[PDB]
Amino acid sequence: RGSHMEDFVRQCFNPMIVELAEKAMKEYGEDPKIETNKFAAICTHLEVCFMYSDGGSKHRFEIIEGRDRIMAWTVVNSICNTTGVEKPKFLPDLYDYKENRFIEIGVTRREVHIYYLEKANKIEKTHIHIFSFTGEEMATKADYTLDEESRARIKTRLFTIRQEMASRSLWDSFRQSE
Ligand SMILES: O=C(NCCOc1ccccc1)c1nc([C@@H]2CCCN2C(=O)COc2ccccc2F)[nH]c(=O)c1O
Ligand SMILES: [Mn+2]
Ligand SMILES: [Mn+2]
């Protein structure tokens, strides 16, 4: 049963992001052919994590998301044993070598206030940065890590994705599936 959102995801995002999203869903036991809105969300958040990592200097960010669960936990062990930072209870998405903290990036369909609460509820010392499909962002202690142009590029891409879905009538189903 091939959905329209599955075919849109493969045309909307780059193949390396699509393949990483598939492996991430097959691990943890999910099907991109069925949980197709979730398939889109993983690709979206993966692309945001990659753009974020490209916003700083060359050696600034270590990327944790998009890895196998074991090697992602391997890299944070090495980070924490090199930096002397607390090992996070849950896997974060990035590490900032310049500001010496982990980052949990969020991409949300609701308003940025509510998700940060939920994200901070499950969190203690790692930095938190939320993006929305409506252009809003919220970061821990109002420190948005990157400069304005890099974040604005991420917001523009998010709104383009929402437009492309709406143009095919997939947005309403994607908005109310979170
Ligand atoms: O890394 C994360 N989870 C570890 C892998 O879990 C998986 C579970 C099922 C399938 C694939 C992976 C992590 N999870 C989450 C959220 C809220 C907490 C649990 N959750 C998920 O299950 C959904 O995943 C995401 C939701 C939106 C954007 C990116 C995501 F990935 N949001 C994040 O931003 C995030 O980075
Ligand atoms: Mn993650
Ligand atoms: Mn995240």
Author numbering: -3 to 53, 73 to 138, 141 to 195
Quote from the publication.
The influenza virus RdRp is a heterotrimer that includes the polymerase catalytic subunit (PB1), the ‘cap-binding’ subunit (PB2), and the endonuclease-containing (PA) subunit. The ‘cap-binding’ and endonuclease functionalities of RdRp work in concert to perform the essential ‘cap snatching’ of host mRNAs to generate primers for viral transcription. The essential endonuclease domain within the PA subunit is a particularly attractive drug target. The chemical scaffold for our studies is 4,5-dihydroxypyrimidine-6-carboxamide (DHPC), which was originally developed by Summa and coworkers (Merck, Italy) into the first-in-class HIV two-metal integrase inhibitor raltegravir (Isentriss)30.
In regard to the binding conformations of similar analogs, we found that the co-crystal structures of inhibitors that differ only by a single atom type (Cl vs F, or CH2 vs O vs S) show very similar bound conformations to each other. As previously discussed, we discovered that the most potent R1 linker was one with X1 = S and X2 = Cl, even though there is often no significant difference between crystal structures with this R1 group and other similar R1 groups (see 9b vs 9f vs 9h vs 9k).
